[PDB]
Structure 1
Amino acid sequence: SGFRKMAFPSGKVEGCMVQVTCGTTTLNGLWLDDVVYCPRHVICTSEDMLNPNYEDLLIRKSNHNFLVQAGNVQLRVIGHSMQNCVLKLKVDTANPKTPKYKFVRIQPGQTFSVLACYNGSPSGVYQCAMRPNFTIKGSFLNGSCGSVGFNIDYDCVSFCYMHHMELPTGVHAGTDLEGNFYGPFVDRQTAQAAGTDTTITVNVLAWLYAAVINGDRWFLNRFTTTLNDFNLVAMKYNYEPLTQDHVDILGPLSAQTGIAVLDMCASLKELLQNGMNGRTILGSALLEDEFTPFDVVRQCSGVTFQ
């Protein structure tokens, strides 16, 4: 038993990380087949970033201005183009470590693993959630741009996030691998509002089911509630409204534990109204919302990949 915030094994993604240099700026790229993907602001000076005209800046660049370095293997750039907020550098060599992969645009509330990288070398791996306001709460320093977020289905890596920027909150924003930002953000050094965040209700419930599976059951109360009744408590505490789609998603956990979803909702409602009274659930004194129902099920059934 036990329950931990667990990332996917990162080996398949490690083999794809490269270093991309244009001028003095160096960031990370993702090398898949014969294309390297990276944030387009690799082409900016520090001053350009205040208000860059990326088309005009890219026109001043040629293939040989982009230095792509894979460990010490170094790649010849034979084409470049800008797709939304990413650059695609065509190289003369296919990555021999390219895994089976897919580019996906994830939904708010979903989770993914991040492989944090600097100069094209991995530093660490951690799990998180795409917030409802399309930010993530990461750990990113200068030079981390181009680090990617991903999920694994057995042998297939689904890339879903590339890091671009940090917002005036210490939160982080980025794009999918077609270069479209999650949320309203633009890749410019100018003040930008994230907007109000909300707690991912279906993930909290999943985590309460995780708790029961692992023996933590003090919060299991006696009451029940209705969707409406719970959704009224939800808006007060800035939780996403629960839908029947969410109830259905929680079906397997409901069946494994014998606790109806609406009964679990009544427990959650009491936790929101009365707090935890200095107790903990799964080692936490806060209600956790960065485990999806799928995350809980894989961790309590032992799903593997390779």
Structure 2
Amino acid sequence: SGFRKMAFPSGKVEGCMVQVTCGTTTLNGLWLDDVVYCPRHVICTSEDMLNPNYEDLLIRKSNHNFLVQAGNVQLRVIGHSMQNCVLKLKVDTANPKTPKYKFVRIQPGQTFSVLACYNGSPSGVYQCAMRPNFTIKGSFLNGSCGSVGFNIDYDCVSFCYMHHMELPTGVHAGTDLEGNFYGPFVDRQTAQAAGTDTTITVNVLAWLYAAVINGDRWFLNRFTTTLNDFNLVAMKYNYEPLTQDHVDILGPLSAQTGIAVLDMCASLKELLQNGMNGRTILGSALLEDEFTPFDVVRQCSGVTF
């Protein structure tokens, strides 16, 4: 009586991981075709990180100042540029393991797999969610920057996250693969805090549908609600409002169970207002919010890549 997080197979991403070093600063890069993508703070000394002028620091760097290694094999850098908070290093070798890929910018609440890497070497894989406050939970240690998050769709890898930093609460923050941070964070060693977080309503609904599919349906009630009335109530419980897109991505689970989305919204509303009354759902006394509607189908359907 449970439902477990499942990461994507990581092999396609493992074949793209390299290490990038400047001075004594080493982090990970992503090698796709003849370009390596990595966090721009690789060009900083530890002291530079306190208050960096990245345009000025990059002016002082030449191609030959960058050590890019696939394992211990050096890839010669033949060009460099900065795009927002990422550095793009052109190399003289096209990665033969490049998968079909896209760069995407994900929404809060969307999940992805992280391939945590150190010195260009993959160490572990785990599933996480972009929190509404634009942080993520999970393990990142010294040397993990440049590790990426991704989804797979058929045979195409959609990269959505590159790791840059850890906040005081221990959660993590980063950019998309165009170097734009998720959230209001900056890549400098300055006082930064994660904002107040909220619960990912669309994902809770997905998980309630997973419960129904598995025969755990005591919480279905006889009410319905409008989306607007539900969104106003949800925010009082520190739950995210639903978008029109959220309603639509729940479509398949609603169809499979025959439970209208707004009826499930009314059932969630009563759980928020009344509590769980000593009961569990899928073995949990807590409402789980890090499975998307897609995660529920992917796991109940056996999708491969």
> One fold, TM greater than 0.5?
yes
Contact 1:231 1:241 in 2 (8 A): yes
Deviation, structure 1 residue 246: 2.5
Give the number of equivalent residue pairs.
Answer: 305
Which range moves more in the overlay, 293-302 or 280-289? 280-289
Deviation, structure 1 residue 249: 2.3
Deviation, structure 1 residue 113: 0.8
Which range moves more in the overlay, 42-51 or 221-230? 221-230
**How far apart in 1 are the matches of 2:123 and 2:284?**
26
The change in CA–CA distance for 1:191 and 1:246 in structure 2 (over 3 A counts) is same
Q: TM-score, normalised by structure 1?
A: 0.94
Note the residue ranges of structure 2 that are not aligned, 5 or more in a row. none
Contact 1:3 1:214 in 2 (8 A): no
The change in CA–CA distance for 1:25 and 1:283 in structure 2 (over 3 A counts) is farther
Deviations 1:92-148 (A, max 9, x none): 111110001111111222111110101111111111111222211221111000000
Contact 1:2 1:214 in 2 (8 A): no
**How far apart in 2 are the matches of 1:289 and 1:241?**
14
Contact 1:99 1:156 in 2 (8 A): yes
The change in CA–CA distance for 1:195 and 1:87 in structure 2 (over 3 A counts) is same
Q: TM-score, normalised by structure 2?
A: 0.95
Contact 1:27 1:144 in 2 (8 A): yes
Deviation, structure 1 residue 51: 0.3
Corresponding residue SS for 1:281 = coil
Deviations 1:153-177 (A, max 9, x none): 1111111110001112211111111
Deviation, structure 1 residue 301: 1.7
Deviations 1:180-231 (A, max 9, x none): 1111111011012332222111111011001111222232234333334422
The change in CA–CA distance for 1:62 and 1:282 in structure 2 (over 3 A counts) is same
Contact 2:25 2:44 in 1 (8 A): yes
Note the residue ranges of structure 1 that are not aligned, 5 or more in a row. none
**How far apart in 2 are the matches of 1:206 and 1:182?**
24
Contact 1:3 1:299 in 2 (8 A): no
Q: What's the C-alpha RMSD, in Å, of the aligned pairs?
A: 1.7
Corresponding residue SS for 1:300 = helix
Deviation, structure 1 residue 11: 0.3
Deviation, structure 1 residue 87: 0.8
Which range moves more in the overlay, 68-77 or 171-180? 68-77
Percent identity of paired positions between Structure 1 and Structure 2? 100
Corresponding residue SS for 1:210 = helix
Q: Residue in 1 aligned with 2:284?
A: 284
